[PDB]
Design a binder for this molecule. Sequence first.
Ligand SMILES: NC(=O)C1=CN([C@@H]2O[C@H](COP(=O)(O)OP(=O)(O)OC[C@H]3O[C@@H](n4cnc5c(N)ncnc54)[C@H](O)[C@@H]3O)[C@@H](O)[C@H]2O)C=CC1
Ligand SMILES: NC(=O)C1=CN([C@@H]2O[C@H](COP(=O)(O)OP(=O)(O)OC[C@H]3O[C@@H](n4cnc5c(N)ncnc54)[C@H](O)[C@@H]3O)[C@@H](O)[C@H]2O)C=CC1
Ligand SMILES: O=C(O)[C@H]1O[C@H](OP(=O)(O)OP(=O)(O)OC[C@H]2O[C@@H](n3ccc(=O)[nH]c3=O)[C@H](O)[C@@H]2O)[C@H](O)[C@@H](O)[C@@H]1O
Ligand SMILES: O=C(O)[C@H]1O[C@H](OP(=O)(O)OP(=O)(O)OC[C@H]2O[C@@H](n3ccc(=O)[nH]c3=O)[C@H](O)[C@@H]2O)[C@H](O)[C@@H](O)[C@@H]1O
Lengths: 402, 402
Amino acid sequence: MKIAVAGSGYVGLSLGVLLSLQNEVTIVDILPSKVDKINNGLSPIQDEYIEYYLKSKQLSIKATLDSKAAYKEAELVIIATPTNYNSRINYFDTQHVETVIKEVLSVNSHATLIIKSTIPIGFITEMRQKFQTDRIIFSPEFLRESKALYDNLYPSRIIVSCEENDSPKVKADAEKFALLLKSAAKKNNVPVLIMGASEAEAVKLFANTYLALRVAYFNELDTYAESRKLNSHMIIQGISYDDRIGMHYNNPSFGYGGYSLPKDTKQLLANYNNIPQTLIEAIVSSNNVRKSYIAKQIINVLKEQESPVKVVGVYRLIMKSNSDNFRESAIKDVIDILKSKDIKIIIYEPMLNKLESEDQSVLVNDLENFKKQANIIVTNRYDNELQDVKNKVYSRDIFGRD
Amino acid sequence: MKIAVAGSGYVGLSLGVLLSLQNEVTIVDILPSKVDKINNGLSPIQDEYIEYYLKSKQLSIKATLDSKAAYKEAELVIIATPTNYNSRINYFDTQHVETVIKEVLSVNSHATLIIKSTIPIGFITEMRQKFQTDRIIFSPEFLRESKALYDNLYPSRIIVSCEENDSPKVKADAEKFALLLKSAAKKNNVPVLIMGASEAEAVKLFANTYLALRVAYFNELDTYAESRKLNSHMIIQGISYDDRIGMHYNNPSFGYGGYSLPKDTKQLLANYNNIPQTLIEAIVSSNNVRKSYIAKQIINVLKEQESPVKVVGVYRLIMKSNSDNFRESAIKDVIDILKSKDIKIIIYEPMLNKLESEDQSVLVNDLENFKKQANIIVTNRYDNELQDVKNKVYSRDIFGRD
Ligand SMILES: NC(=O)C1=CN([C@@H]2O[C@H](COP(=O)(O)OP(=O)(O)OC[C@H]3O[C@@H](n4cnc5c(N)ncnc54)[C@H](O)[C@@H]3O)[C@@H](O)[C@H]2O)C=CC1
Ligand SMILES: NC(=O)C1=CN([C@@H]2O[C@H](COP(=O)(O)OP(=O)(O)OC[C@H]3O[C@@H](n4cnc5c(N)ncnc54)[C@H](O)[C@@H]3O)[C@@H](O)[C@H]2O)C=CC1
Ligand SMILES: O=C(O)[C@H]1O[C@H](OP(=O)(O)OP(=O)(O)OC[C@H]2O[C@@H](n3ccc(=O)[nH]c3=O)[C@H](O)[C@@H]2O)[C@H](O)[C@@H](O)[C@@H]1O
Ligand SMILES: O=C(O)[C@H]1O[C@H](OP(=O)(O)OP(=O)(O)OC[C@H]2O[C@@H](n3ccc(=O)[nH]c3=O)[C@H](O)[C@@H]2O)[C@H](O)[C@@H](O)[C@@H]1O
């Protein structure tokens, strides 16, 4: 089948390559760099499986900047563009998704549009009324960065929306798409759920909010443990042996980061409007409180030192273990708070070439010089190459993952 | 070994019977009824395994009101008395545990005292200083009511506290006790953790608080679902397929109830004092908000009816599925809120013989009359015997469990 995918990020590229094994895929983007990379078998992001598929699999995939040409030819269009949370409007800025819907509808009268980008609850319904069509459905995406294609090869589940009174074509396409994902998976028993759009939009926001809830909870337990001089690993291990709690996704950090959890928890809170709740709002505030607590602990360690200048060395800015980006990295907010103090900040981050011109932080990518200059080394996740300066490293990492 | 157990409740009786297979157990209580029942092979509470063991196993177990005689003879004393949360003092009322420690210490100079009752973080340390001894340790209890003995036959884990500078005897007893629990289990691979008292006290409060967090979260998702006319089962099923979230302990209700979750979440919040957090306090408030929301939904359904008198029929007061008690049952708080309105309340609850004299609610244990009189039937968990009046039943139960 001829499929067009809007957006070549983690989601777009993962799905485009997944679907390119037995379908004719065209990935659309507005960045020439990504288009040329893809057209030459190169992945714009670090991902073991995407890199492997582009390099060694028979794929029917190409990229283009020509939006209209790609969408006109498509039988199905998958939308995977950004959906940033905008603090000014207290909501997701859905312009990049809407602009694609408009473009697709203006040149294609038969294709069903499938949104993979995380969206507000009620968005499909709002878009269907705005554009006066039923050819728009949602299929949430659950992949994790660094396992973008892997998670669609071995998905937890597949969900696609369909409304009772949708046209036979849209209903058939919703089903066909769910089955294209199922058949492309290498995993044998993948649950497939077909539900209303609002239910599906809710699934995605409530699932990510639960993951943020869990990180936030283990981080508050960790705040307590550090404040009371208790062994955090012993306590976490003790509660995690209850299989209703579990030994996964329970490693303390400076806060939940990444492009997704921060913005999605905020979006869910907004969708609640005045519906009664107290936990949803606390999951968002808990991250802020955790970050401020971490900043104060660092500040207190520093004032216990006798040095003319106090220098904090930040070891890495990656948003989680094995990440290739710093989107909403928790340590960056901690840094912001430390900056309001008389503290010099140096950053060790190989993936970065230069800091923005106004940044007062100083990038020191020679590890040895970095260790020498830092009075204290702050890092979200520990790494063995810090072994020789271990006694001046501050981190709440316990399990070395996530 | 000669073991004395203080308290014949779910915890005390479960452990006393468990340990009575290969040890000489004496259970102590202040209620003559419980002592006579136990001495005659009868369980004071409903529990399939305890009833089976008392009736068909070779047990070395007896009960007595004679506290001092039991404690003087003991080699180990297990304390399983109440630890209620007291709203006036903003803390657990630990008098029943302290009174037992005092009694044991006054007549026994060698036995180590093991607390199974859930206690405040820092309590062992406080008690050790108050009584000036190190012969007091904590071993949290994780059993569920209705599976009291079953959960100790198949425990998730075993935890016993020990401090680095405790006497060789207390350290040896801490270990021996952990191994008495391990060897008495029928489960083969049970993790055994030895940790500091404060860490162990924290494990118990943080584990129960996570279970309350989970119930509170799925209940807030349910509030949202009902408010927006969405299918709650579809949404919950959709997020639960993520194995990091899970298909367990996720059934909506009128709130988390039982003697334990309500009081333990409140106790943890108190132990936090001013340590930074926002989630811990929200887990407690979320229950209140959920209950008030449920009461309003019922009130709204009622005002849509044209009857001279509006009657709400409450189907059962049990605190959870298969429970034999109503401790902190969520529906009771909902009832309290409905009472401030012009609503007649009738209750169907076979396990109850009479309501307190001042109660304006009326107990109607003839099911047929109950169904006839109720304009709307409210219940925490559905039951098939309500099939014929299904259209007037209000419940948020989805999965028929917990
Ligand atoms: N990153 C992840 O792990 C997951 C992200 N999501 C959601 O999927 C959406 C995309 O996320 P990512 O893939 O991480 O984003 P990304 O930022 O990595 O990639 C977005 C791409 O879309 C391109 N783009 C912007 N406007 C476009 C337009 N008008 N037409 C065509 N291309 C356009 C951008 O140039 C960029 O290459 C977001 O809503 C995100 O919340 C969902 C699951 C996982
Ligand atoms: N019920 C449960 O599922 C679990 C309860 N726990 C904790 O264990 C403790 C006990 O809970 P339950 O067993 O449910 O209580 P319960 O209320 O069922 O039983 C307590 C028993 O102790 C007796 N008692 C009171 N003072 C006594 C004294 N001074 N000397 C001797 N006996 C005395 C009472 O008469 C009563 O029979 C509480 O701290 C509870 O939080 C821990 C795990 C599970
Ligand atoms: O919607 C999305 O975009 C995706 O967001 C997350 O995936 P991802 O953002 O790649 O990252 P996670 O591995 O979930 O971690 C998120 C943040 O929480 C933090 N975290 C996670 C787990 C943990 O134990 N501790 C912890 O601090 C991580 O360091 C990271 O900053 C979800 O796991 C995906 O299912 C979802 O599809
Ligand atoms: O400390 C205790 O005393 C015990 O408390 C709970 O056991 P229990 O109180 O018997 O009851 P649960 O089955 O945990 O249920 C607690 C409350 O949450 C509610 N709940 C639970 C699960 C769920 O999916 N939905 C839900 O509403 C139940 O209806 C009930 O009112 C814990 O499960 C035990 O591990 C712990 O040892």
